[PDB]
Amino acid sequence: NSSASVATAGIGGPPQQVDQQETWRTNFYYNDVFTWSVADAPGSILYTVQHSPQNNPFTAVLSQMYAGWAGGMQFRFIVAGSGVFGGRLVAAVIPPGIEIGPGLEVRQFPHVVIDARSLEPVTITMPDLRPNMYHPTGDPGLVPTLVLSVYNNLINPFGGSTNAIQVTVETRPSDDFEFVMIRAPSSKTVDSISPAGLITTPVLTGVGNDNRWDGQIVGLQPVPGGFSTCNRHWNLNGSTYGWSSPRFADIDHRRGSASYSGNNSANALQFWYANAGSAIDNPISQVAPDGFPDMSFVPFNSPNIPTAGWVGFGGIWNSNNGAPAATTVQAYELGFATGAPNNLQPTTNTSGAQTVAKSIYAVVTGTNQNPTGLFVMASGVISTPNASAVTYTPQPDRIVTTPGTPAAAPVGKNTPIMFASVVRRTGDVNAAAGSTNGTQYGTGSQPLPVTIGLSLNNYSSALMPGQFFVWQLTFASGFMEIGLSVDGYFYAGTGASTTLIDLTELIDVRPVGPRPSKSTLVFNL
Amino acid sequence: NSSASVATAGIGGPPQQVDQQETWRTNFYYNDVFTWSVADAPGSILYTVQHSPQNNPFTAVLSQMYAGWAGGMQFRFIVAGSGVFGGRLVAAVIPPGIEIGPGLEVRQFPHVVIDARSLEPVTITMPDLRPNMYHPTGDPGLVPTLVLSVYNNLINPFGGSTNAIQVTVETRPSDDFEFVMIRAPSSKTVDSISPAGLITTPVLTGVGNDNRWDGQIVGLQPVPGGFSTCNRHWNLNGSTYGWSSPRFADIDHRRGSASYSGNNSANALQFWYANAGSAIDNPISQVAPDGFPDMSFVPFNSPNIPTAGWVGFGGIWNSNNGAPAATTVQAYELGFATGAPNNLQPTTNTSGAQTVAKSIYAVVTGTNQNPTGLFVMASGVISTPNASAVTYTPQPDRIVTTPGTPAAAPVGKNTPIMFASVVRRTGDVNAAAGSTNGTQYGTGSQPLPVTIGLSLNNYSSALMPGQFFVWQLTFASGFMEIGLSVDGYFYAGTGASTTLIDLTELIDVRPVGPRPSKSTLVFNL
Amino acid sequence: NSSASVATAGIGGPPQQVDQQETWRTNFYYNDVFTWSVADAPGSILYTVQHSPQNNPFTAVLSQMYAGWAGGMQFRFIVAGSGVFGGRLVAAVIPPGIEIGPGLEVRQFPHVVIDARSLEPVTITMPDLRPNMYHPTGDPGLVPTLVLSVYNNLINPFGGSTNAIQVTVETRPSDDFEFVMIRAPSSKTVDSISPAGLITTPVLTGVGNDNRWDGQIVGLQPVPGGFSTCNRHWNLNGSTYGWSSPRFADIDHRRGSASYSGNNSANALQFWYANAGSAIDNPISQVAPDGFPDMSFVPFNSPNIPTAGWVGFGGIWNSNNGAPAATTVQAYELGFATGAPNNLQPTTNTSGAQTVAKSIYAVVTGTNQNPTGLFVMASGVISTPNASAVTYTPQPDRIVTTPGTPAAAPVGKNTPIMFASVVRRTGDVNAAAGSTNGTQYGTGSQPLPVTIGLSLNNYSSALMPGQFFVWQLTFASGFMEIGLSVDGYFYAGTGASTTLIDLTELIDVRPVGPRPSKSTLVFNL
């Protein structure tokens, strides 16, 4: 690999200003560590990095201080384990012009080998292979990448009882490394925007809540079979495929049709429905009124209760009138459906759907009119039998989504998870119940604070489509990793387990950074 | 001019560190030739080319092996003369970022004159005008342009038809030219050039098919009125505006209404329809289902057959059970229409339309159902009564388009072309034609391996919106040029022509690389 | 051994007159790796390769540019060890014309030992054994072989499952290696290697389709009983024994007899047949018409449907007039049979057979005519009653073959494979299945771009009848090898397996070049 690049790092002028500083470059300090197991395949990539000053601790804080950089940086690797262990690793410096993934053939680029038995550390100096121009802390332009790959797999002769060893990574800047465009310290560009700050501990401990139910988040729920979600959900492209803005507020739809069933004008069950694409007061999407639940309706016939329906309180409002008609005000079961008045069927897709309401108990005096509005409150309560507390609501089938929505499915051994929260439940009027309030797990895709920050800031040039942004969770007994995708869905490396993970013994959350999607999030509980 | 700069290029070049290949390249190799006539006016530009590793053919093969390039290229010019013809051309090396087109004069540039009376070739070195920045082979950036323009008019002493001579160009890399970043010439796909591979000899010869009727390409059809195409179309930005898959696939639509009109349940024409924009089971877009024809319907009255209709074979398919109805199996006209079920009228706008199907002959027993599905085969036949019929189908007026689709209209003397194929026609019981095939012409806007390849790999930033990518088609006798826009339309230089070009006597196809879109593409057949 | 011959090669080499490329090739590049276990017996041959410009990847790219080659190649071997395992391998440079296979011993050859306890790589030069005759790049002739065989058995001190280690090979061209006859690296097609291009990553990924049902390839199916295929099949000799075109094309047969059996002219099953070997309007061979299925008929009785029948949609077409009959339009079973019109029995021999068609449902009015034509579409559907049905179709017993067609039967542990795809099934009015696709498996013997490419360019004398051309298929987790015989069958190394291999998690495909056919192809998935 090149070495004349240093003369080119060498060129200065008006970026230097006064009084440049070598800073500390002398010794090697801990950047990172990686694990190598007998499990891992030849041609698998254990460690990768683009050349940057964010590869020492000292040059990452100086990055705020300086606006531009140039030159080489040295990477030192220490294999720890034993001299009795077979296997070999390959470290190679790759020039820019590349897309890294399944076709990027590490063992056919100029490279050096690292042997597992090495007692002493092995060093590489990584130069600049495009040294002609200063990089800012904006776009650097395309830079060389350092990749370490397994050439032949780790062997223990004493069997499978011990099966992994670690390799340390240490760095120091080289001689040719320099900085420029100092200015004075402040915050700047792409550096200040990262998905990291969305998730944090106080939100999961007790400050945060879900985006479907406004509940307190008690758990993490794995969903092996996948799911799809859009309403009040957001991505790292800054937009939503939903019809709700990211806050809880009343459901107002001005044009629907209203009727009642029982052939009696007083003491009857109220019905309201409308087709999708008439939400004239909603800017987000005219498909349904903001605040309307993303679930398919649940059939009930009087006096029988809906088994795990969404219920909210409200009543019927005509457009000419300043406030709703009181006689109509009652609890309603709400959902998305097709086939109103009396051929009702649930719908999982918004295209050709109908937004439907029916009162769970009798209204004082009904109303027959068309068109006329529906006015129902911000968050809902769960309708379900008396002492019911089985699994969670909605199940993946129950969630309604648009045809623009991308679905959440497993990637590798990484499984999508939903955030589980405590919801109010009711067993139908009076009687008895399993407890004082009863147990009930309502689930959402996201914590509402993450949803507000995806809507607030655009993170497209801040997490790549192949990556997850990763944080690690610490529990009193055990720890795990959790990931957020660019499509807004959250993942865990739990595989096919369904067990509820308890956030109530949560000590901590902290970022691990960007990781590629296929590679498994840690689960040790 | 800039021939001192040999030593100042030699600071920008050397950080890379690589060998010089001199011994192979003693001789110059053929690049192109152009024609010079008595009617080519002074100020006109006959020939232009950008600096690129693709100018010498052997350097193009070597470009594959390397990820960067730099240094100059020599150009050598031969005038074919006579010695009795007067006139001159001017050769200038144009700076980077100076727009090329007919507005461009050589007037105030450094230049050499190329003389009509010359008998000796005249050799210019084209130096590197970017040398501080090494160029990538697969993302190069901005380069200079070599331009040749007519200073003085070609004049002949005598009469006759004889009015033209040719000027040949051959090239050789200079002693400053260099390849660097060998790495692994291992597993990159588009090292080979992405745009250039779209058209090839055996593909235009007999391997290729067209992307709308699946026929064999016999010819090229100019459309001097211009035209528009959205479906099964891709482009050099990777984007599309269609609904149908990149390959040909069968029609399955689960959600329609079926009915018939008449005085009886039997020996009637079956009708089925569903709305446009409702196909939520199509991954590409909801405009219609996959396999659905992008040409407007043909109204007809029982018992008569539609002409220049798209007909396909299929039947009514039960949505609840998932299974066909045999009695319904018949040939059907499938099309886009508006005014369903019974006020039907034709449109070319998808929005607010209905995708409609009607049988071309009597079904034994019809069915009235809602909902019911439609299941029809992939392949399509043109409906035409006995012998002599319509010139080519679809005509540009028949084609439907969806918002976002740009239309292709002539530029200068370049006119947009469609690809013509021989297609199967059926129409009217025991009909016949004047020929055995019954010579019926189906047209597509692209060849299908091109539609598939432009959907499989990226092509962005390779061709400039002012330029066309050019290939030269070579016949046993004569040649012509064909061009590709950024948009993914093909163009040819026949001007106000409607005449069909016969591709039967094709020997070869070669890439000519980008050329300005106002440059006429030559026609000598 | 033969390392004196440096100066005697230098008379045979020099008449050509060319430069030496040294500066690019400082380092060695990855060629392959193989596995060494406690169960690989002494005398066994683990790895073999012929001298060829295709061993180093960058030399392969350069081979394109040149029409001849000569000189040696260095080979470098790394044992992955541990230091507690005993055993040895022997490395010999084998003379030209000495047959390779398991009968081959290293016993009396010059050799080096490669040691289990080795920690340092061991490097052999493979000299040119042909130097008086310069080799062609695109017709090379006879070369020597490098062979590695087990001298002493791998032994472990301890128990556990741990029983294997790997040995890597990397190569570098020698200082004697040379390229000559640059000419024009211009316009030769198969400069690139003809055999190697047949299988590619995006082709096995999602661009390829199979050559009998036109479906998407999901898997590989081993057939440990062996099988035979003639139609739409080509080979590495360019020869075929089929009737149908290299692409999928519609059935048109002008000369048949049509009849029905029953008690009435209406609501009957139409039957049509013509003899095999009579299709004089088919350019390829008169065995049947173009588009006709190469699987034996399925007898059925009215009113029941055939199972695992080939069904296609079409009708009776008037031979005198050249035009269809609408009333006859229906779904038909098309097949090869013997015993027509009414003693019909199935066969797999074409000679003395009849190509037969029978409708699967009632036609409104039937026709009795002689002669009358048959006109049916290209695409085909599998006939199956409701849900659970046959494992794959065609089964090897159903396939018809014509004289001259060789059958593919296992060799050693390599077994012949068919390519599996998901195909459309229809059968029995308003039927259904357990899944929405109704998971029906269609099989082809080759991928269709391979059938088309093996018909488009020549391939003779590239692969030796004892060897198989090998490609390596690489997955996200594990890898396997696939092989191609001279005959144009594909093979895999699953032995007595019938289990279907799922190609869903494929990352990559790379050519491994020829290997002896008795060599097992590896399976680690």
Residue numbers in the entry:
A (entry chain B), B (entry chain C), C (entry chain C): 45 to 569
Question: What is written in the article reporting this PDB entry?
Answer:
The etiological agent of RHD is rabbit hemorrhagic disease virus (RHDV), which has a single-stranded, positive-sense, polyadenylated RNA genome of ∼7.5 kb. Mature RHDV virions are spherical, non-enveloped particles with a T = 3, icosahedral capsid whose outer diameter varies between 32 and 44 nm and whose structure is defined by characteristic, cup-shaped depressions. The only capsid protein present in RHDV, VP60, is composed of three domains, which include the N-terminal arm (NTA), the shell (S), and the protrusion (P), the latter of which is further divided into P1 and P2 sub-domains.
Here, we report a pseudo-atomic model of the RHDV capsid derived through a combination of X-ray crystallography, cryoEM reconstruction, and molecular dynamics flexible-fitting (MDFF). In addition, the resolution achieved in the RHDV inner shell (radii between ∼130 and 150 Å) reached 5.5 Å (FSC0.5) compared to 7.0 Å (FSC0.5) for structural features at larger radii (between ∼150 and 220 Å). A complete pseudo-atomic model of the RHDV capsid was then built by docking all the domain structures into the cryoEM map followed by MDFF refinement. MDFF not only improved the fitting in the loop region around the 3-fold axis, but also closed the gaps between B and C subunits at the interface. Next, we compared our current structural model of RHDV with the previously reported backbone model derived from the 8.0 Å VLP cryo-reconstruction and homology modeling. Second, except for the β-barrel core motif, the loop regions in the P2 sub-domains differ completely between the two models.
